Design a protein around this ligand. Structure first.
Ligand SMILES: O=S(=O)(NCc1ccccn1)c1ccc(Br)c2ccccc12
Ligand SMILES: [Mg+2]
Ligand SMILES: [Mg+2]
Lengths: 162, 299
């Protein structure tokens, strides 16, 4: 399940992936992820998010993040949303986050966890390494934020199954 | 008995996540932490029974939200007082131990690892989300000593008599002993608009932020300073002030605002409140975009 998460980063780009197993059915987890206009639903770093019009390919949301972070704003563009295959692709097109040409692929797959309905979520990305940082630093920084967001998605999904 | 002022504001910031505390006579300190057994034994006053009242001042710069800073204002002095009262039943080591166990207990309460009292019932869930945290710089002020415990990038500065002298060092990730501790645990300190743990948090020590665990710890840094007939004032402030005002700049202004109130004129104290108000507005006029919180304690 990395036909969707295989990347060819250039020499001055870095790529990685993070995964998370969620004790909730895929339909519930995907219904959270699909809501492109409300990332605050499971991302604790988001304090507001605006996007004009309906959710469609090419839609752009303007994300404001809370205090205690290196960035404050981020402009992100919906590249792919497959509601049948549960694939969400986003591209960063602005913001003070220093993550340029950031492209990411999120997929959610069915799994049995402890005999009950579960979910595997995988988010991979490619991004330019900004000058003055290493590939190991850029990956570690992005993975840490993605890991916190997937853990919060797991908590949100599992406390809506109760 | 204590003489202080306190000023705080959003500033240009969207939301207010700073908090402060000023608790007079919050506890009684066992004097064996403030005087040699043999210097009090010379007066026949064995310090194992003596205690002296003390006042608690604290500033708590929250991030990710204000719920953790507000919790520190409500809870840290209560936990400190219960900790002092039982210790009475090397003194530098003892000060570090009572402050370390107090900060750890509050951190464990914030993160939901231990239960907390609310009424007579108990709550065990975390106080708020995983990304919410707060600095904590507290000043224990009694007649003989000022005891400072610092956790984060807030700062307390003493004016004695014209020097600023820093009673706390900012817990920035690039700071050498902090970077070494973080990397020894397999972590990383990354420059990403400033040096940050995992490239995210601009501090290596705080209350809360359970998602940056075990790299961001609640261990406070303690400094015991005896009061010498020379001190002017204490200045506790979030980095909203220290980002645009230096230790020299803040000390000379606070010490002068106190003097100009008493030559012009005869809860908070008006002269010290004027110093805190002036320092807050001064930071506003020098281009500070953060929350501002200033406590001035007239010694
Ligand atoms: O909205 S997020 O919660 N998405 C998670 C995320 C973060 C970073 C990269 C990819 N994906 C977010 C949090 C913190 C920072 Br710093 C961000 C900076 C730019 C864009 C989004 C940012
Ligand atoms: Mg703050
Ligand atoms: Mg601040």
């Amino acid at each position: 399940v990395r036909r969707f998460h295989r990347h060819e980063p250039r020499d001055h780009q870095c790529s990685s992936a993070v995964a998370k197993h969620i004790k909730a059915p895929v339909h519930l987890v995907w219904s959270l992820v699909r809501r492109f206009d409300q990332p605050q639903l499971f991302k604790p770093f988001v304090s507001r998010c605006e996007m004009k019009g309906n959710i469609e390919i090419g839609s752009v949301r303007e994300v404001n993040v809370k205090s205690g972070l290196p960035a404050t704003r981020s402009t992100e563009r919906l590249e792919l949303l497959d509601d049948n295959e549960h694939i969400l692709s986003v591209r960063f097109v602005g913001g003070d986050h220093r993550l340029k040409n950031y492209s990411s692929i999120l997929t959610v797959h069915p799994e049995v966890i402890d005999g009950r309905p579960g979910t595997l979520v995988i988010e991979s990305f490619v991004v330019d390494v900004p000058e003055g940082n290493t590939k190991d630093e850029t990956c570690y920084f992005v993975e840490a934020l993605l890991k916190c967001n997937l853990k919060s998605l797991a908590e949100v999904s599992e406390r809506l199954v109760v | 008995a204590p003489v202080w002022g306190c000023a705080s504001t959003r500033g240009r910031s969207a939301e207010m996540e700073d908090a402060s505390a000023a608790v007079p006579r919050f506890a009684d300190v066992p004097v064996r932490l403030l005087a040699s057994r043999r210097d009090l034994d010379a007066l026949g006053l064995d310090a194992d029974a003596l205690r002296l009242p003390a006042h608690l001042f604290g500033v708590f710069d929250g991030h990710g939200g204000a719920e953790v800073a507000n919790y520190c204002r409500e809870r840290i002095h209560v936990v400190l007082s219960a900790a002092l009262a039982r210790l009475g039943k090397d003194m530098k080591e003892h000060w570090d131990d009572v402050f370390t166990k107090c900060f750890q207990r509050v951190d464990d309460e914030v993160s939901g690892r231990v239960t907390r009292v609310v009424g007579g019932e108990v709550r065990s869930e975390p106080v708020t989300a995983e990304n919410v945290g707060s600095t904590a710089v507290v000043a224990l002020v009694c007649s003989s000593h000022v005891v400072v415990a610092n956790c984060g990038d807030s700062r307390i500065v003493l004016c004695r008599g014209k020097e600023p002298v820093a009673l706390s060092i900012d817990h920035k990730p690039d700071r050498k002993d902090e970077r070494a501790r973080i990397e020894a645990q397999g972590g990383k300190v990354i420059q990403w608009n400033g040096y940050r743990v995992s490239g995210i948090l601009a501090m290596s020590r705080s209350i809360g932020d359970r998602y940056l665990k075990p790299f961001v710890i609640p261990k406070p840094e303690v400094m015991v300073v005896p009061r010498a007939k020379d001190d002017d004032c204490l200045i506790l402030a979030s980095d909203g002030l220290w980002d645009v005002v230096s230790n020299e700049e803040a000390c000379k202004v606070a010490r002068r605002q106190i003097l100009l109130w008493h030559k012009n004129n005869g809860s908070t104290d008006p002269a010290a409140q004027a110093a805190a108000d002036y320092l807050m507005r001064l930071a506003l006029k020098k281009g500070s975009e953060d929350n501002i919180t200033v406590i001035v304690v007239d010694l």
